[PDB]
């Protein structure tokens, strides 16, 4: 089941606005909108999802994941984004141009209101200096956000993700997600 990621989690929008990442007219083309590492099992955007919370109960996982975007802008608005995935071991893509050379999808809002990107493979392995390098997915402005007159010039992307059929987990363990220790009474 694909559930919403929090890609904007930082100390600014605190609320239901923590689930939404923006786009605007003022942002020039060919610059970064947002990025997030893809791993279910570490802190950050995946702690909100099931696949993220369900991987806390198991030590080892691996398989393919499915990341999906949805555009809430107006029917009149148009533009393009470049959503690209850099495999683990490669760092943050610095430029759209180098980002394009990897695995990407050009996604035009006017045509599709939703895009989907299948990250091929991802799993954990051990044996905080390790810091578990994994892939990241970035979302770039291909073209500036085009809007007609008398229409809002600011919109939100909403990102959600889930595992696919070959995703598996093993070696059960309890979660650190709760420190509560027996409310009772």
């Amino acid at each position: 089941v694909e559930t919403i990621l929090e890609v904007n989690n930082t100390t600014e929008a605190t609320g239901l606005t923590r689930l939404l990442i923006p786009v605007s007219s003022q942002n020039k083309a060919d610059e970064l909108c947002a990025a997030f590492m893809v791993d279910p099992g570490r802190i950050g955007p995946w702690q909100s999802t099931l696949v993220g919370q369900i991987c806390r109960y198991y030590t080892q996982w691996s398989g393919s994941l499915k990341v999906t975007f949805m555009f809430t802008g107006s029917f009149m608005a148009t533009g393009k984004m470049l959503v690209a995935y850099s495999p683990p071991g490669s760092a943050q893509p610095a430029n759209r141009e180098t980002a394009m050379l990897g695995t990407h999808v050009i996604w035009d809002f006017g045509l599709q209101s939703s895009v989907s990107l299948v990250i091929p493979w991802i799993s954990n392995t051990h044996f905080n200096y390790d810091y578990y390098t994994a892939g990241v997915v970035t979302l770039w402005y291909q073209t500036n956000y085009v809007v007609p007159p008398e229409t809002p010039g600011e919109a939100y992307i909403i990102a959600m993700g889930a595992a696919q059929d070959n995703f598996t987990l093993k070696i059960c363990k309890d979660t650190d997600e709760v420190t509560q220790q027996a409310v009772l009474q």
Binding site: E2, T3, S48, S74, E150
Partner: protein, 216 residues
């Protein structure tokens, strides 16, 4: 009508061989529309409640001791091409709101009032929707039977839900089988001069109903 959500992949059925009101209860009930605006925080309807005091369906439920049925829900949102936003239409079984404003004791713990638990025909409104007032993470609400109604794309959402419960029959007044939660994930935005408040209309058809234990 493009896509219907069929809850849990299973159709409503009658009692698996307790009476049936023929076709008499089969018809659309259209609730008072909710007016959605920039700051709107969401709504919910405890479902075998909303129809309790209104209609021919309502007279049966109050006068019968046991109750069974499924439903078909249509949620329409009328708005221009210059408005934008998104709503999350979900049907979540045994939806139980919670006391907020923490005071933790056996005594003074602030339990919800009846008007807050069972809202009635006019539904209720989330204080803080981020937790769905359940303490649970809304970002995971997509588990339940759900549909996105996104003004950019189709403005209608329809969901059929079967009767679900641990028992075959249960009281219509006391127990609320499922609630219907409508939240404005991405806030409504509009340019100056457009109509400010967008209506939300929910139509519900109690298909496949049963009653029993009439009270003179």
């Amino acid at each position: 009508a493009a896509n219907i959500v069929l809850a849990y992949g299973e159709w409503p059925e009658y009692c698996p061989d307790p009476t049936r009101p023929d076709v008499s209860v089969n018809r659309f009930y259209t609730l008072d529309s909710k007016m959605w605006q920039e700051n709107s925080t969401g709504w919910y309807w405890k479902f075998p409640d909303v129809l309790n005091k209104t209609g021919v369906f309502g007279q049966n439920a109050q006068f019968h001791y046991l109750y069974r049925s499924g439903f078909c829900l249509h949620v329409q949102c009328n708005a221009s091409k210059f408005h934008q936003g998104a709503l999350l239409v979900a049907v979540i079984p045994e939806f139980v709101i919670a006391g907020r404003g923490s005071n933790t004791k056996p005594n003074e713990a602030p339990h919800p009032g009846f008007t807050t638990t069972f809202p009635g025909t006019t539904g209720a409104t989330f204080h803080d929707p981020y937790v769905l007032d359940s303490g649970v993470p809304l970002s995971q609400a997509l588990i339940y039977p759900h549909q996105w109604v996104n003004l950019r794309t189709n403005n209608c959402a329809t969901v059929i839900v079967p009767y679900i419960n641990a028992v075959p029959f249960d009281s219509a007044i006391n127990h609320s089988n499922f609630g219907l939660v409508v939240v404005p994930v991405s806030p409504l935005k509009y340019s100056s001069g457009a109509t400010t408040a967008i209506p939300i209309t929910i139509t519900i058809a109690p298909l496949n109903s049963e009653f029993g234990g009439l009270r003179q």
